[PDB]
Design a protein around this nucleic acid. Structure first.
Ligand SMILES: [K+]
Ligand SMILES: [Mg+2]
Ligand SMILES: [Mg+2]
Ligand SMILES: [Mg+2]
Ligand SMILES: [Mg+2]
Ligand SMILES: [Mg+2]
Ligand SMILES: [Mg+2]
Ligand SMILES: [Mg+2]
Ligand SMILES: [Mg+2]
Ligand SMILES: [Mg+2]
Ligand SMILES: [Mg+2]
Ligand SMILES: [Mg+2]
Ligand SMILES: [Mg+2]
Ligand SMILES: [Mg+2]
Ligand SMILES: [Mg+2]
Ligand SMILES: [Mg+2]
Ligand SMILES: [Mg+2]
Ligand SMILES: [Mg+2]
Ligand SMILES: [Mg+2]
Ligand SMILES: [Mg+2]
Ligand SMILES: [Mg+2]
Ligand SMILES: [Mg+2]
Lengths: 132, 325, 117, 208, 80
RNA sequence: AUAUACCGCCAUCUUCAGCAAACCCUAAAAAGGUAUUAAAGUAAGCAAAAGAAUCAAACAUAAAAACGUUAGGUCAAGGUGUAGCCA
RNA sequence: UAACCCAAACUAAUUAUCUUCGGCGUAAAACGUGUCAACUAUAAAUAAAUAAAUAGAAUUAAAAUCCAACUUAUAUGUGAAAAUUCAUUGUUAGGACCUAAACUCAAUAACGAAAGUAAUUCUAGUCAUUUAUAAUACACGACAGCUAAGACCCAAACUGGGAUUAGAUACCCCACUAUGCUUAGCCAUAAACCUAAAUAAUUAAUUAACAAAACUAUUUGCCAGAGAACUACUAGCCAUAGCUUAAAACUCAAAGGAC
């Protein structure tokens, strides 16, 4: 049996998001890609360096916004600009988000030497695609 | 111990609001695309959403959509009883009020025809509606046994003398079979600078592709890639494959063909030319002959192509030796 | 006439010793048993022997037994069609009688009841 | 298969399509009208309306082919037919007028009648009686009877020949010696019949 | 009151479980014990069933008509 | 050190047709619950199906394949419970 | 460590206090069968004439066996073989024998207390006590077995030979005896079970399961966890490796019935 990235069935009480519900074979069919860069296109270089930055950028955002992430973040690279689009729960006060945005942007712009912007869409609570 | 989200049944006020938001959506989408709201249509909407939200997901159900609420929201079956609680339909307690209400009518029709007392093929090339289509008409779910019984009752109605009312009735449950035109698409007949008539058609066998240019008048001179056919095809079986189209129609030595085949091997290239010549020669033969070609295999593309190899297997079907135990 | 079943079983009514000792209760079931398969008989066995008989005399040379060889084909050719025609038609028709499946469904439309309703 | 089960095998008989409509039996006439609404498999690369195409020889060629080498197998068959035609012309020219009449110089007619002679009519088969297998004489079917004649020919020539002889020279000499019913392949047919004779006792075990 | 296998209709027992009264036509082979208002009579003949169907239809229509008239008379008195 | 504490990622049955939740019925129920000319079963979820992929079409091939079975495989991909070494 | 119970007591060992109106188709239990007493109950005055009860005598159709005539070269036997046999084998409208057993009828259900009993014929013969209820008495009691004398077609423990198997003191093959039969006597045992005592009712006021529906009264018999135990000891007996009668020590926390 295949165990890869499959949220298995319980007794109908496990909420799962759209991203979690779909197994790997639905990638490019029902669900898209969380990161969009040009490094895996044919005749393009620096796939390894873009992929390592993604791993870190995801671990950074989880720790910097602990318990405030409704879904996995979406990374969008255009030219040298990096754009982070994160669904965040409305747990923290509003002013705290302004602090963490200023901090996380400046810190990641001086770490990778690129302009990095954070885009936050706040949800009242996690969106449930289906109960499995 | 059931704790899952219940069906979010859509009330009429809900769908009514979903139609006001959609109507305001169209006016905004029109203003974005610079079009006139009055004439903006469903077709323009689908094109606009595809431009503004490019998605390359293979399944099109998973792509962005701004459709009318009627298309997306399933028709809610209306309440079957009123405020006092009395069901609206006398067959409510059967559990299949619409299936049995229809079977009640057809059984009553049969009785009047049998009591009251020509060719029955008033409609031809038609089929009985499939179970899925019937379910939609009744707005309920049926079993296979329910479908089988409904058809038998409808057949009995046709057997009996039928007035025009019955013919219209049974018509509702007969779907016009869109029998496809399994006939050749004859090519046009162009004219060269010399003024001679000629037709062209493509052919594909395995990975080979050919583009023949048959001429209406000729002495049987076939040139493949600017070479003769005896030179290009040193094997007899490959030449016989080029002979099959003309020999069949007794048209040997009456046409001049110019071929251009690229790709594949010797046998795959002869086969591709055979199909290309058969399809080009259609314009210079009678329709009865074209059917004679189609029914002899000359006009069908061969779908047999090399099958991908499988991981964990020696070949497409060949397996690794099951090791001795 | 069905044999008598009065004073056979061992019961408090019966004064004498029992006659019948059924393995199972004597109550008609609502089904019939699945009829055990029946096979046919060899066809053209006589014609095969005739062909083989001629070979033995003529050192298994088909030149001598040309006529007999053609009779063997003739019988086989007839039987070949007969088995084809009879399986396609007679078996499908089931006109003469009901099968175990068809019989049981009729026996269930008017089932035997050994219990009060 | 890449052909859906609704596809029909092609009919590549030139005369059939050009026959007058009245000459066709209504059963044949019915199929033509039905086929107008059906799908037709493409003809094979070896399927042609040629007047020189013989299915029996085309099948015999495929049974000699090794590893998809159709050119070599077809070449060997062409050399065989030629080797038989050249062997009969020599005999015909070197024969009296009376003898010349009997001599057959058609290689296609020597090939067909040679194979038919080798065909075995009855061969032993394993049949199950009482959960046990017995070797009972059985009537061989048409396809199995034809296959056995060709297989026995291609196997005598392939194996039981000198090292320096070639297949067109062993096959020609075997088709000709089976056109007169005096060859090794005929002896193999006489063994299959001889063995069935010994086991005739178990003939009635057959249930068809 | 019997199904097509000559057994009591399932709704006879299930209607008693729900405490629903039952008016049933019972013949000499049926079980009237659970029928609230048994009507002994022939259930097979078309003339018997047609008579019973007519009686239940005329009875029900009369009762519904009487209710309309009773409501009109009493309602009219309220203004009058 | 322990895969006989596990995660992770798989094998096998298997391209097998089931699985589990909420109910309902039984002269009591350990359990069982189908008959279509229908006799106590019902209506949702997962799997199958459908759909998508191999860039017309079909077919085919891939992929997919629930709950379980084998304390199946892997502490040596990485991580980790408990125990152990720390000149 | 804390809690809980009892408390000038508390725990352990020992002993004692609680005792039949229940059961007997399958869980323990209806005696192999019948008859005669005294009680305890019961209340009617019938029965019998029955197709295979029982005993005796006579009888015989089929199939065997023996002798004889003629006669294949083999006969016999198995899943396959071997062994065995040619003093055989097949036929006999030929002779003798009268050993043993009773096809069809029997899809019948009779008789008898039970055991048991069905080839034919004849003789003898079952029968009335209101009913239930009996041993320490009397009379019976399949099959096997014992004693003496006979019978002997066939079958057949044992035994010998052949085969199978790792072995085969077996299952299969061949030969043959005790024995099955008769005449007396003995033995007294069976899953002697229709696992249901007999008699008179009743069929509603009534499903532990399964089996062959439930259930009342009467009288006797029997049962009281399993194993030890169809045993030990005792007494009776034609029984002597026997039958009936029938414990305890000791062991266990279950055994058992139905599903
Ligand atoms: K018994
Ligand atoms: Mg290969
Ligand atoms: Mg039994
Ligand atoms: Mg009735
Ligand atoms: Mg494991
Ligand atoms: Mg697999
Ligand atoms: Mg597709
Ligand atoms: Mg699928
Ligand atoms: Mg393990
Ligand atoms: Mg291991
Ligand atoms: Mg007992
Ligand atoms: Mg003799
Ligand atoms: Mg005699
Ligand atoms: Mg007398
Ligand atoms: Mg021995
Ligand atoms: Mg003796
Ligand atoms: Mg004796
Ligand atoms: Mg005893
Ligand atoms: Mg007895
Ligand atoms: Mg004893
Ligand atoms: Mg004793
Ligand atoms: Mg003693």
């Amino acid at each position: 049996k295949n165990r890869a990235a499959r949220v298995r069935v319980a007794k109908g009480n496990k909420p799962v998001s759209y991203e979690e519900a779909h197994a790997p074979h639905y990638i490019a069919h029902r669900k898209g890609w969380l990161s969009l860069h040009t490094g895996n296109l044919d005749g393009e270089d620096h796939a390894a360096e873009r992929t390592l930055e993604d791993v870190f950028l995801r671990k950074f955002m989880m720790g910097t916004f602990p318990g405030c992430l409704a879904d996995q973040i979406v990374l969008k690279r255009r030219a040298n600009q990096v754009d982070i689009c994160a669904l965040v729960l409305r747990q923290l006060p509003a002013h705290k988000f302004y602090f963490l945005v200023g901090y996380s942007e400046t810190l990641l712009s001086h770490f990778y030497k690129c302009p990095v912007r954070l885009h936050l869409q706040t949800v009242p609570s996690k969106v449930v695609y289906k109960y499995i | 111990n059931v704790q899952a989200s219940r069906q979010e049944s859509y009330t009429e006020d809900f769908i009514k609001k979903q139609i006001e938001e959609f109507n305001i959506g169209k006016r905004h989408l029109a203003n974005m695309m610079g079009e006139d709201p009055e004439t903006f249509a469903e077709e323009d909407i689908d094109r606009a959403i595809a431009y503004l939200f490019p998605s390359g997901l293979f399944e099109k159900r998973a792509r962005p959509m701004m459709k009318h609420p009627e298309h997306i929201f399933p028709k809610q079956r209306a309440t079957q009883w009123g405020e006092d609680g009395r069901p609206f339909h006398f067959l409510f307690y059967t559990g299949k009020q619409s299936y049995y209400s229809l079977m009640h009518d057809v059984y009553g029709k049969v009785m009047q025809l049998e009591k009251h007392r020509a060719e029955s093929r008033d409609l031809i090339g038609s089929r009985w509606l499939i179970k899925e289509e019937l379910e939609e008409m009744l707005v309920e779910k049926l079993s296979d046994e329910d479908y089988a019984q409904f058809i038998r009752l409808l057949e009995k109605l046709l057997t009996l003398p039928c007035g025009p009312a019955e013919e219209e009735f049974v018509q509702r449950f007969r779907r016009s079979v869109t029998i496809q035109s399994k006939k050749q698409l004859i090519e046009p007949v162009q004219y060269d600078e010399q003024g001679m008539a000629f037709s062209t058609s493509e052919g594909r066998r395995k990975s080979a592709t050919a583009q023949a240019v048959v001429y209406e008048h000729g002495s049987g001179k076939i040139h493949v890639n600017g070479v003769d056919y005896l030179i290009y095809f040193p094997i007899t079986q490959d030449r016989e494959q080029l002979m099959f189209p003309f020999h069949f129609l007794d048209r040997l030595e009456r046409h001049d063909v110019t071929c251009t085949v690229s790709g594949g091997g010797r046998s795959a290239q002869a086969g591709a030319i055979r199909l290309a010549m058969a399809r080009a020669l259609c314009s210079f033969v009678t329709e009865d002959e074209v059917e004679w070609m189609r029914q002899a295999g000359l006009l069908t593309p061969d779908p047999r192509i090399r099958e991908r190899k499988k991981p964990g297997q020696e070949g497409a079907r060949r397996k690794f030796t099951w090791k001795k135990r | 006439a069905t044999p008598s079943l009065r004073g056979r079983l061992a019961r408090f009514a019966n004064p004498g010793k029992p006659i019948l000792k059924p393995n199972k209760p004597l109550i008609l079931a609502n089904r019939v048993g699945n009829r055990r398969r029946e096979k046919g008989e060899a066809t053209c066995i006589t014609e095969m022997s005739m062909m083989m008989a001629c070979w033995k005399q003529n050192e298994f040379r088909d030149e001598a037994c040309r006529k007999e060889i053609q009779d063997f084909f003739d019988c086989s050719s007839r039987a070949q069609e007969a088995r084809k025609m009879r399986s396609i038609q007679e078996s499908l028709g089931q006109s003469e009688s009901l099968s175990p499946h068809k019989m049981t469904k009729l026996l269930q439309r008017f089932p035997n009841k050994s219990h009060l309703i | 298969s890449r052909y859906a089960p609704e596809f029909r095998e092609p009919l590549i008989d030139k005369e059939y399509y050009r026959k007058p409509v009245a000459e066709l039996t209504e059963e044949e006439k019915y199929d033509q009208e039905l086929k107008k609404t059906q799908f037709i498999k493409a003809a094979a690369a070896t399927e042609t309306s040629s007047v020189f195409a013989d299915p029996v020889i085309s099948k015999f060629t495929n049974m000699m082919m090794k590893g998809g080498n159709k050119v070599l197998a077809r070449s060997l068959m062409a050399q065989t037919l030629e080797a038989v035609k050249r062997k009969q012309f020599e005999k015909y020219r070197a024969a009296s007028a009376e003898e010349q009449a009997t001599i057959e110089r058609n290689p296609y007619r020597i090939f067909h009648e040679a194979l038919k002679n080798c065909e075995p009519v009855i061969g032993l088969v394993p049949i199950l009686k009482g959960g046990h297998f017995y070797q009972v004489p059985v009537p061989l079917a048409d396809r199995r009877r034809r296959f056995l004649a060709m297989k026995w020919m291609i196997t005598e020539c392939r194996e039981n020949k000198p090292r320096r002889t070639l297949m067109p020279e062993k096959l020609s000499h075997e088709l000709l010696e089976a056109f007169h019913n005096r060859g090794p392949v005929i002896k193999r047919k006489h063994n299959m019949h001889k063995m069935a004779e010994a086991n005739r006792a178990l003939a009635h075990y057959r249930w068809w | 009151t019997l199904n097509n296998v000559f057994e009591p209709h399932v709704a006879v027992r299930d209607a008693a479980k729900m405490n629903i009264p039952t008016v049933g036509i019972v013949d000499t082979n049926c079980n009237p014990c659970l029928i609230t208002y048994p009507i002994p009579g022939n259930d097979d003949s078309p003339q018997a069933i047609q008579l019973f169907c007519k009686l239940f239809r005329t009875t029900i229509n009369r009762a519904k008509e009487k209710r309309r008239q009773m409501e009109a008379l009493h309602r009219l008195q309220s203004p009058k």
